Amino acid sequence: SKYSQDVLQLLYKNKPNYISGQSIAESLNISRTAVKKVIDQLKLEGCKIDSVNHKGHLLQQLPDIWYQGIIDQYTKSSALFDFSEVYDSIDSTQLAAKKSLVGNQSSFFILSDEQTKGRGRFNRHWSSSKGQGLWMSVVLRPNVAFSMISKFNLFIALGIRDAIQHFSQDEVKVKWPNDIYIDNGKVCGFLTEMVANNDGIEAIICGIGINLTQQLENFDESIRHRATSIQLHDKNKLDRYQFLERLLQEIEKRYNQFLTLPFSEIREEYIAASNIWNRTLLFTENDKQFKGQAIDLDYDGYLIVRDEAGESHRLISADIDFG
Ligand SMILES: Nc1ncnc2c1ncn2CCCCNS(=O)(=O)NC(=O)NCCCC[C@@H]1SC[C@@H]2NC(=O)N[C@@H]21
């Protein structure tokens, strides 16, 4: 309905108190009977709303669906983000973000319950199941040189890891430079892109995909053994709204660190949170592949690699597989 988001927002704003049907009706200038119809539909979509005679309605729990009216509250109180766009389905939040950033200096994020053309690094297919993951693109406006893209990627990794770690009883680790793992399971892939020229960055677009509630059966058999979800490591129901709130918190925290701190001030923290050490790694580099060991991460965020032949490498980025 036309007023479903408006009603949902009123319910959300008024927690933990009940709000009467009459008061919603007056707030939105619609009838009591249209308020009731909207609320029945919200409950049908899986909103847990307690309704009590003479008292009104209390929103108790939201379903695994993104609602614009709720997310609007997140951006209203955000010092970072001007707005969000929320979709049930699109080709890709990253395509959408890249179109929406043109011609303005707004900071914003784009969420979709489902992506039909999710793409990771090297245009690889990213599986984006409806109602099972956070598929999001974040657009930010750092006033910095284009070479700073690499350090942004390192800072944001730690924020995403921290947000996920709050909900996982199991160790969450970063694989440099672009993924998050729980044990052998990839729980998140992110990538950082930019629009830029020699005078500076016009926008950062960080595309973030986080598996929230997949069971193992919900991953294609080709990736099942290398994929996992937060829910598979959380004894409690993962609430996607609680999680998003924590994720935006950490993104903002790490973005402000990115603007103010050298990478050397988080380099040790990064190293202790990574899962690339003390193991043979497989590198892909255009048409050639080689094996090696990660020796160090230097003050600039470059990986120091000693390959199979004993030769050292210093890498701004790499395409790394475990085995
Ligand atoms: N759901 C899943 N979970 C675990 N594994 C899966 C999987 N789907 C496929 N695979 C195996 C294949 C991985 C190959 N990619 S990677 O090179 O290893 N790293 C990587 O791509 N990072 C960046 C990912 C960017 C996704 C976000 S989403 C929102 C935004 N909009 C969009 O379009 N992109 C971005």
Is 92 a pocket residue for ligand 1 (Cβ < 6 Å)?
A: yes
Nearest-CA residue for atom 17 of ligand 1: 121
296 and 191 within one domain: no
CA 226 / ligand 1 centre spacing (Å)? 12
Q: Cα separation of 264 and 301, whole Å?
A: 8
Whether 22 and 80 map to the same domain: the answer is: no
Residues 6+ apart with CB under 8 A from 248: 74, 78, 80, 81, 109
The verdict on 143 and 198 lying in the same domain is yes
- Please tell me whether residues 36 and 99 are part of one structural domain: no
The answer, yes or no, to whether any atom of ligand 1 lies below 6 A from the CB of 136, is yes
Q: How many structural domains does the chain have?
A: 3
Resolution in angstrom units: 2.0
SS (H, E, C) the chain: CCCHHHHHHHHHHHCCCCECHHHHHHHHCCCHHHHHHHHHHHHHCCCEEEEECCCEEEEEECCCCCCHHHHHHHHHCCCCCCEEEEEEEECCHHHHHHHHCCCCCCCEEEEEEEECCCECHHHCECCCCCCCEEEEEEEECCCCCHHHHHHHHHHHHHHHHHHHHCCCCCCEEEECCCEEEECCEEEEEEEEEEEEECCEEEEEEEEEEEECCCCHHHCCCCCHHHECCCHHHCCCCCCHHHHHHHHHHHHHHHHHHHHHCCHHHCHHHHHHCECCCCCCEEEEECCEEEEEEEEEECCCCCEEEEECCCCEEEECCCEEECC
Ligand 1 atom nearest to 190, measured from its CA: 23
Q: What atom of ligand 1 comes closest to residue 128's alpha carbon?
A: 1
Ligand 1 pocket member 100 (CB < 6 A): no
**Residue 69 and residue 54 share a domain:** no
Residues 262, 304 within the same domain? no
Mutate to test the pocket of ligand 1, among 126, 178, 281 (most ligand atoms within 8 A of CB): 126
Tell which atom from ligand 1 comes closest to the C-alpha of 227: 4
Q: Which CATH number does the domain housing residue 305 bear? A: 2.30.30.100
8 Å CB contact between 195 and 101: yes
- Residues 53 and 88 grouped into a single domain: no
Q: 235 and 298: one domain?
A: no
What is the extent of the structural domain holding 96?
A: 64-275
Question: Do residue 310 and residue 254 come from a single domain?
Answer: no
> Is 167 found in the same domain as 130?
yes
* Domain at 157, CATH number: 3.30.930.10
- If asked whether residues 128 and 178 sit together in one domain, one would say yes
Kindly report the CATH number assigned to the domain that includes residue 47: 1.10.10.10
